């Protein structure tokens, strides 16, 4: 289902969870002609009160989004969240099919380190 590169950071000064969506690679092809039109939907479980979407990157299986989204999350609540990064195939007329997703449970993220990480997308 491809791979996603992202970076997770927390601005303690402003109580901001910072989600960098760098790129995806080796995505499956969902359009005729052997390509896709990927974008990423980004939101937090379990409350789901704010969703972001990257730009749509047309006709590519290796989109470089280079976008960053911020969520106001009080520090004491951050460990109860799960970050969802869901990669969709855009289509002009039909429903947008999900390609894959990667979820990050915050109750294991320490922010003891901030890195750019690759993950295999999952169903």
């Amino acid at each position: 289902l491809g791979k996603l590169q992202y970076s997770l950071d927390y601005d303690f000064q402003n109580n901001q969870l910072l989600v960098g969506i760098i790129q995806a690679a080796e995505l499956p092809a969902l359009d005729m002609g052997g390509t896709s039109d990927p974008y990423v939907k980004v939101f937090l479980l379990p409350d789901k009160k704010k969703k972001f979407e990257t730009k749509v990157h047309r006709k590519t299986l290796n989109p470089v989004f280079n976008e960053q989204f911020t969520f106001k999350v009080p520090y004491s609540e951050l460990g109860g969240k799960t970050l969802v990064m869901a990669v969709y195939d855009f289509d002009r007329f039909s429903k947008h099919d999900i390609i894959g997703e990667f979820k990050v449970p915050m109750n294991t993220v320490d922010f003891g380190h901030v890195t750019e990480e690759w993950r295999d997308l999952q169903s």
Partner: nanobody
Amino acid sequence: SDSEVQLEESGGGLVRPGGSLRLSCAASGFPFSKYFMSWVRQAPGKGLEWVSTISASGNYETYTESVKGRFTIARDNAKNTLYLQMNSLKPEDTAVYYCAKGSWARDMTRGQGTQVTVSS
């Protein structure tokens, strides 16, 4: 809320077509090294438009189609500074250039701007 953010551009000026210019931007009031940063511009007669974004790490750079290959974005997280090297400048590149906090959003926090005019 970016009430504390301060962004200060410099480096603008008059350029002949084909010439070069380097902008810089001093950033204060927020953990600069954690944020993606962007250059955006507003040309005479057009809306604000995205020019380039650099990741917080400085490792990933993206560029609007009309400046690809000609502009380079860079950052120094130790000195909280953002740079835009502009080579092979075109008259269409005339605009107020702004350094901006985050990846592209029409309402993103921006500096005061620096004027770049490309003229014969």
